[PDB]
UniProtKB/Swiss-Prot annotation:
Protein name in UniProt: Basic phospholipase A2 VRV-PL-VIIIa
Range within the parent protein: 1 to 38 of 121
Species of the source: Daboia russelii
Quaternary structure and interacting proteins, as annotated: Monomer.
Presence of keyword Hydrolase: yes
KW Secreted (keyword) present: yes
Tissues of expression: Expressed by the venom gland.
Amino acid sequence: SLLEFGKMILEETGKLAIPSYSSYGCYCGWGGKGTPKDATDRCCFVHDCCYGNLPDCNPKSDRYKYKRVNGAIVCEKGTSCENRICECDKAAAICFRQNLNTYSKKYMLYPDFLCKGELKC
């Protein structure tokens, strides 16, 4: 869930998921429309495409477990969903860390009426 996911962001970027990533750009939040402003937003877009490809699961609700092995996130092996969801979050959490150098405060609390366009997964 967002509880597990928030731990990953914190544990990889050193920042609190909320409010640093809960309302960023066009895809780091509840919505999802238009073109990703930058790399970080792009991280959010693909993460949406990952959740969107788990029809039989409920990404935001289902809880799951993971651990640290050599400092790297290791998704355990509960249910397929738990596993899949955990794998979607880890990719995203690391995508966040990998692009920290281009993170912009200017895309925080971005108004969604400025997110125009379309992008397939």
